[PDB]
């Protein structure tokens, strides 16, 4: 139950540029801006957010937008997975996770998800429970927040989402990070082609460098 | 700001956007996450066909809005 209590409690967030420490207020998007040095970064992977036409990386296909470049294990990508497949990554690696609410849990005022958000109310902000529908087996969280929780475990244990990619996802990933559209070489059958891509991806493209890990 | 894109299959993805993002930019993000070329993408919002040169704010597309993705098919 250790993993969930940590996700639920109030978390820190640190600017990767100036290192000022904050308390994370949930409810906004993944784009953060430091109030101390104005640096823009992703809460999921701590990589920078560039203004349009400011990105230094070459062969950038989204150069004309505000964007950052996120690694394959950032929440930016993993939030699109089903809860089932995120659970699989954890199960394949023998990481326990919660499916039921905490032991002696306290009831939530209205209904729905217990995750406290700083919400936008008329003429300001207000702390309040998520309140979205909580499916059975989602530990008392809503769909999106439950996935966030599973992703925190996945990141903490340095698990590679690529072990679960279908060949199409490998090709999409190869093109994103190596800028080449891959294809089967002659004589290569589909199982060999898939395995080749998973191996080339593993060894050339590391998981998030700035995602905090456990030991 | 976050928005959703769903296909008729029911598969839904979440994109990070700003209101100033062009429709072209949004197709480029879908390509990044899904591998689908922009030339094969048709996006619809509230029944309106979204045109490449316009922005999300042109169509009054707010936070948490859902766009619909339909693939395009062209003859040889
Ligand atoms: Zn800072
Ligand atoms: Zn990120
Ligand atoms: Zn870039
Ligand atoms: Zn929630």
Helix A83-92 to helix A143-156 angle, to the nearest 10 degrees?
20
Encoding tokens for residue A171?
């090709």
Contacts of B23 in chain A (CB under 8 A): none
Residues B39 and B37: their CA atoms lie apart, in Å, by 5
Report yes or no: B54 at the A interface, CB cutoff 8 Å: no
A54 Cβ contact list (under 8 Å, min separation 6): none
Integer CA distances (angstroms), A194 to A152, A170, A174, A183, A204, in order: 28, 8, 12, 10, 16
The residue count of chain B comes to: 76
Strands A124-129 and A116-121: antiparallel
Identify the residue whose tokens are 């060894």.
Answer: A203
Widest distance between CA atoms in chain A:
65
Strands A31-33 and A40-42: antiparallel
Identify the residue whose tokens are 């005022």.
Answer: A109
Report yes or no: A179 at the B interface, CB cutoff 8 Å: no
DSSP structural state of residue A206: P
Encoding tokens for residue A184?
């089967």
Q: Which of A115, A134, A102, A131 is nearest to A24 (CA)?
A: A115
How many structural domains is chain B composed of?
A: 1
**CB-based burial label for A61 (10 Å; 0-12, 13-18, 19+):** middle
Residues A131 and A146: their CA atoms lie apart, in Å, by 13
Rounded to the nearest 5°, which phi and psi values hold at A136? -65, 135
> If you measure from the C-alpha of residue B76 to the centroid of ligand 2, how many angstroms do you get, rounded to a whole number?
39
Identify the residue whose tokens are 């590391």.
Answer: A206
Q: Do the chains contact at A80 and B1, CB–CB below 8 Å? A: no
Give bridge partners of residue A12 from the DSSP assignment. Answer: A23
Residues A93 and A150: their CA atoms lie apart, in Å, by 13
Rounded to the nearest 5°, which phi and psi values hold at A48? -70, 150
Task: Give the residue extent of every domain in chain A.
Answer: 1-215
Report yes or no: A62 at the B interface, CB cutoff 8 Å: yes
Resolution in A: 2.2
Instruction: Give me the domain span that covers residue B59.
Output: 1-76
Residues A138 and A164: their CA atoms lie apart, in Å, by 21
Encoding tokens for residue B21?
């993002």
Ligand nearest to the CA of A67: 3
Identify the residue whose tokens are 């290569």.
Answer: A188
Helix A190-204 to helix A167-178 angle, to the nearest 10 degrees?
40
Strands B2-6 and B66-71: parallel
Of B16, B21, B34, the CB nearest to A29: B16
- Tell me which residues of A are annotated as active site: 29
Q: Which of A168, A194, A180 is nearest to B11 (CA)?
A: A168
CB B69 within 8 A of CB B41: yes
Encoding tokens for residue B75?
């003859």
CATH number of the structural domain spanning residue B49: 3.10.20.90
Strands A116-121 and A40-42: unpaired
Identify the residue whose tokens are 């429970």.
Answer: A129
Residues B13 and B30: their CA atoms lie apart, in Å, by 9
The three-state (H, E, C) secondary structure of A6-69, written as one string: HHHCCCEEECCCCCCEEECCCCCCCEEECCCCCCEEECCCCCECECCCCCCCCCCCCCCCCECC
Integer CA distances (angstroms), A114 to A44, A98, A129, A135, A146, in order: 21, 15, 5, 13, 11
Residues B72 and B31: their CA atoms lie apart, in Å, by 14
Compute the half-sphere exposure of residue A151: CA atoms within 13 Å on the CB side of its CA: 23
Residues A7 and A11: their CA atoms lie apart, in Å, by 8
Q: What was the experiment behind these coordinates? A: X-ray
DSSP letter string, A90-153:
HHHTT----SS--TTPPPPSSSS---EEEEEETTEEEEEE------TTSTT--HHHHHHHHHHH
Residue A142 assigned as binding residue: no
Contacts of A62 in chain B (CB under 8 A): 25, 28-29, 32
């Amino acid at each position: 139950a250790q993993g969930l209590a940590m996700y639920l409690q109030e978390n820190g967030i640190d600017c990767p540029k100036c290192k000022f420490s904050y308390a994370l207020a949930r409810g906004g998007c993944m784009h953060f801006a430091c109030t101390q040095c104005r640096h823009q970064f992703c809460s999921g992977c701590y990589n920078a957010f560039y203004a349009k036409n400011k990105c230094p990386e070459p062969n950038c296909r989204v150069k004309k937008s505000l964007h950052g470049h996120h690694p394959r294990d950032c929440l930016f990508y993993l939030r699109d997975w089903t809860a089932l497949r995120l659970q699989k990554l954890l199960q394949d690696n023998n990481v326990m996770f919660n499916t039921e609410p905490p032991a002696g849990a306290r009831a939530v005022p209205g209904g729905g998800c217990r995750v406290i958000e700083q919400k936008e109310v008329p003429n300001g902000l207000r702390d309040e429970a998520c309140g979205k529908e909580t499916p059975a087996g989602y530990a008392g969280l809503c769909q999106a927040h439950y996935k966030e929780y599973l992703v925190s475990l996945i990141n903490a244990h340095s698990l590679d989402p690529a072990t679960l990619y279908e060949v199409e996802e490998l090709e999409t990933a190869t093109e994103r990070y190596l800028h080449v559209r891959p294809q089967p070489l002659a004589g290569e059958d589909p199982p060999a082609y898939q395995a080749r891509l998973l191996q080339k991806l593993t060894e050339e493209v590391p998981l998030g460098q700035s995602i905090p890990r456990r030991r | 700001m976050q928005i959703f894109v769903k296909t008729l299959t029911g598969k839904t993805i979440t994109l990070e956007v700003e209101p100033s993002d062009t429709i072209e930019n949004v197709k480029a993000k879908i390509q990044d996450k899904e591998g689908i070329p922009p030339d094969q993408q048709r996006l619809i919002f509230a029944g309106k066909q979204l045109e490449d040169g316009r922005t999300l704010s042109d169509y009054n597309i707010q936070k948490e809005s859902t766009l619909h993705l339909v693939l395009r098919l062209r003859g040889g």
